[PDB]
Design a protein around this ligand. Structure first.
Ligand SMILES: [Mg+2]
Ligand SMILES: [Mg+2]
Ligand SMILES: [Mg+2]
Ligand SMILES: [Mg+2]
Ligand SMILES: [Mg+2]
Ligand SMILES: [Mg+2]
Ligand SMILES: [Mg+2]
Ligand SMILES: [Mg+2]
Lengths: 9, 236, 236, 9
């Protein structure tokens, strides 16, 4: 599965 | 520009209303108009700009992945020929995605980065430049793919160098930069060992600085540390 | 029209791809292009048209409700004055919503309804006409509000008269028509007793006809019956 | 809360 990148603040 | 007649403050007010209504294309157009007024952006305003375009390009990236998967299957052995339509429609969505990335990169180049002198603003914008070259690299296949990948790498690297000299290891901008540069290494640059090393060192150096923080800052930093840990669990 | 150069079959193929990618504005534009080829629509094609525009107007309706709530609060006693921006942006979204409803109503009038002779197609289109006048009535406040409400009522009533003469009480089109006309009575026409009576009679007449159905048809009909029951539970 | 209308097929 896809890794996480920076989410909304 | 169609926002040229609207006050800067009114554009910012309407961007916040559009976020509440989940109207992210409107939100991005309002914030583009605010940038084009020519004044520097505050911290809150920078985050409104980033939220707007992240949601627009996020929808485009998800659609592109669905269509690319359908196209690849149609090219497998034994698949019935269906004509040019899947390729045409994937190309349509791809061109619109590239246009959004070019719009963001143009705002950064004219003239957000050159006026950004404080570490928090300069690192924020250089990270954004790396992110939108990375989204271009996800769909690139031609003679320019290597130069797109190097443009992402170069922007992330300048942001890293500034953040290590000027920011504590728990700063949320520094942490989100390292998270995204680590994903660049794993998914784009075919460098999974570099991705794992960066995520681990970033996590460990932040852990050792948590004791300096208030309760609210501790919550902000540990949220992003958990994403570094989740990626390390996926990759090892 | 921008779809005038594309084959009818290619438009339908791309509408199905756009649904898979959750690109509902694209889906609606493809299906508008297919309608404008001038041929009647099959059952599957009618449902693609309805799914596309229901998702587009659904996003607009949700945004309009958020903005209207913010506007109403800003007009309460003690609220700080913030200028014209909330009203302006609510008006912007409202005008775009009205434009989408006018586009659908125009397709129905030129010339889907006049060529629809079978009960399943004619009832489907008259129900759609009632639905999009109902969405116009949700935002109407001026001299035309009563005529918009009567246009919705008239379309729903003609669809009901045909469905009772030509369709069994379990037919899913007949059931969805009655569900939506009942909500028209409760939310738009200030007639909650008519809404409750219609939902109850529709539910009971369908229950008595379930024994005639196959397993797959039974599943289709009971799904919509559950929505009638859920509304009755909310209203009583 | 809002009542239900016909969902997607
Ligand atoms: Mg001014
Ligand atoms: Mg196309
Ligand atoms: Mg400056
Ligand atoms: Mg080379
Ligand atoms: Mg033809
Ligand atoms: Mg406006
Ligand atoms: Mg006919
Ligand atoms: Mg009167």
């Amino acid at each position: 599965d896809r890794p996480d990148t920076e989410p909304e603040p | 520009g169609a926002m040229g007649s609207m006050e800067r403050a009114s554009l910012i007010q309407k961007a916040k209303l559009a976020e509440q209504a989940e109207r992210y294309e409107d939100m991005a157009a309002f914030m583009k108009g605010a940038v084009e007024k020519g004044e520097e952006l505050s911290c809150e305003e920078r985050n409104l700009l980033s939220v707007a375009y992240k949601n627009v390009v996020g929808g485009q990236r998800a659609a592109w992945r669905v269509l690319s998967s359908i196209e690849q299957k149609s090219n497998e052995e034994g698949s019935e020929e269906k004509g040019p339509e899947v390729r045409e429609y994937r190309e349509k969505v791809e061109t619109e995605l590239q246009g959004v990335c070019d719009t963001v990169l143009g705002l950064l180049d004219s003239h957000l980065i050159k006026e950004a002198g404080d570490a928090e603003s300069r690192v924020f914008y250089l990270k954004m430049k790396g992110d939108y070259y990375r989204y271009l690299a996800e769909v690139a296949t031609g003679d320019d793919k290597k130069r797109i990948i190097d443009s992402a790498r170069s922007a992330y690297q300048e942001a890293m160098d500034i953040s290590k000299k000027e920011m504590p290891p728990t700063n949320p901008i520094r942490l989100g930069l390292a998270l995204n540069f680590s994903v660049f290494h794993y998914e784009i640059a075919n460098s999974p060992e570099e991705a794992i090393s960066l995520a681990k060192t970033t996590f460990d150096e932040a852990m050792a600085d948590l004791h300096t923080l208030s309760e609210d800052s501790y919550k902000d930093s540990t949220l992003i540390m958990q994403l570094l840990r989740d990626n390390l669990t996926l990759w090892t």
